[PDB]
A paper describes a structure:
Harmonin plays a pivotal role due to its ability to interact with cadherin as well as all other components of the complex. The results presented here reveal nearly identical interactions between members of the Myo7/harmonin-a/SANS:ANKS4B tripartite complexes that link cadherins to the actin-rich core in stereocilia and microvilli. Both Myo7a and Myo7b MF2 domains bind to harmonin-a PDZ3c with similar affinities via a novel mode.
The structure of Myo7a MF2 bound to harmonin PDZ3c was determined at 2.6 Å resolution. Comparison with the PDZ3c/Myo7b MF2 structure results in an r.m.s.d. of 1.20 Å (for 411 Cα atoms) despite the low-sequence identity (51%) between the two MF2 domains and major differences in the crystal packing environments. The harmonin PDZ3c binds in the same overall manner by inserting the Cter motif into Myo7a MF2’s central FERM cavity. However, the Cter motif adopts a slightly different conformation in the two complexes, namely residues Leu549 and Thr550 interact distinctively in the two FERM cavities due to the Tyr2026Myo7a/Phe1923Myo7b variation. Such slight adaptability of the FERM groove results mainly from conformational variability in the F1 lobe. The affinities of PDZ3c for either Myo7a or Myo7b MF2 are similar despite these changes, showing that some adaptation of the binding mode in this FERM cavity can occur without much cost in affinity. However, several deafness mutations suggest the importance of this domain for the integrity of stereocilia. In light of the new structures, 25 missense mutations of Myo7a MF2 that cause deafness were mapped onto the structure to assess their potential impact on binding to partners. However, mutations affecting three surface residues (K2118N, G2163S, G1982E/R) suggest a role for the surface next to the F1H2-S5 loop and the F3 lobe in making specific interactions with partners. Interestingly, these four mutations significantly weaken the interaction with PDZ3c, suggesting the importance of the Myo7a MF2/harmonin PDZ3c interactions in hearing and a functional role for harmonin-a.
Numbering used by the authors:
A (entry chain B): 433 to 552
B (entry chain A): 1707 to 1733, 1742 to 1977, 1986 to 2173, 2178 to 2206
Write the structure that this text describes.
Amino acid sequence: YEEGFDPYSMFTPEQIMGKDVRLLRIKKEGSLDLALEGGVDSPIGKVVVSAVYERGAAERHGGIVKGDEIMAINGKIVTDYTLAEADAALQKAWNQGGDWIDLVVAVCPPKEYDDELTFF
Amino acid sequence: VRAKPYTLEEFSYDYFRPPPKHTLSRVDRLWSHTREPLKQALLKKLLGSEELSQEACLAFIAVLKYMGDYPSKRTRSVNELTDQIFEGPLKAEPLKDEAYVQILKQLTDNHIRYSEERGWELLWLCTGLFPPSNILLPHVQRFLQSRKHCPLAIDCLQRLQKALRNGSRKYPPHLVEVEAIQHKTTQIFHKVYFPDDTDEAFEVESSTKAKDFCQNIATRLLLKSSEGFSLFVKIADKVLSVPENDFFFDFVRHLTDWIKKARSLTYQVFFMKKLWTTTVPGKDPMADSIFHYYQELPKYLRGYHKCTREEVLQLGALIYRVKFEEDKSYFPSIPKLLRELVPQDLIRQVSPDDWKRSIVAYFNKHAGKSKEEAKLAFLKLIFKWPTFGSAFFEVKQTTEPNFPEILLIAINKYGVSLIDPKTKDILTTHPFTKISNWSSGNTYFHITIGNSKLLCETSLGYKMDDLLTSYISQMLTAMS
């Protein structure tokens, strides 16, 4: 299963240096409800989760959160994809073929700072 | 003979679609009330426009439903039918005149009293969203002027004037607008919250723009200037500033609509200092009294500033004085109220009773000063610091290698400052004049310096972006 995934079969030690790389095999029921942001072009220079909507599929699985990095979609590495290239690949993996979607993600570490309140 | 009330009969002859060719052969006027849905838009202009005629017929079934002239249900939202009526004209100009002629038609020779009372609510809602064209406007005015005895006719005429002046709305009527007119009340009052833990009810109209609203609050509060002040909407988690030229009801409606897509839809309207450029303590007594002290106090207590022990004892004794004035009966309560008197990070540096003894000594040095004088004395001491009037953000920076990963970012009149969170030392200040570009996402905030790039990991990029945009705009317009 997903607990039996080796990220070194897909990535070089330099590629996943310090990253916590996991495999998520999402169910494939209705809407994926997972938004992306970034792209190779962008300031962050990677594909990250911008929102996991409460409705389901990505939320129902629970393995993926806002800030996590999308590294591969159905075996195809998406690290140097643009935002439009990534969104197209994510939708095409969800709509076209299979009974599941295979997402390789770099799990974002806990926020070591107050990222909620602002005093004006 | 007394003149009958004005109808769209004469207007219809030139601007309504002609009657079907079979009409004359047949030995229920287009400009008069029906219970029969339209199959084609009223206006001759929409004849060719298939997509627009379609939307005009959908909005008319919503006008029928609202007025009880078409079956519906015990509808969930008070604004479910009114959104269907106005979403069309708000997204397309040709549909704006269709909205008026449809409503006016349904108010012309309407036998049903329940129906006619509901159509009036719709015309009142319409007059606060957008005016009719220059061609139609006189007819709408003559329609209203000949029906002065109807309780909403003079208000619709008044709203028309405000709609011609302020321009058109972008979002359908808010639930407070719909509930007000259904409750037979044309005046709306909205609560506004201030940093001094008080609130007040201010009158709001459909045409109210955040700038006018801000000016009425400023006038009320006897402020010397409304410059740097702004409305803020606190909904769910989010706290957004309201753009100066935005319609108050459009901002709230859109923000609540947006929150509803990702989901209690309860909001709070705040008035606060946003930009601190022109702020000088002593200049404006009410601005200092209500806003400046109360806004700078929690920033200070979070430990965002670099201060000496002499200053924390002085400010501690000054806070006590704002809270209890000359009363010394809350002196033994200083250990219990330390989180309210001393910055978070320094509390552990000294025992609760050593703080109590030091604060009690400094208070007696502040003579017989009032709660108000104490607010100014606190402000004047902190105005000496380069971090006064800042917006502080805790971020994870990914671009600077000599700087810590966790940074404290202060956005104030001097630009963007990167502060060491531990020492409270300013590592660098990037003036607004040296900031060439910026962007934000849900997980970041980026700034380009010159022809140097800074990437911050944050969920507050939207706020930072707004502040950077507002400060740079303020300066750029001041340079004219």
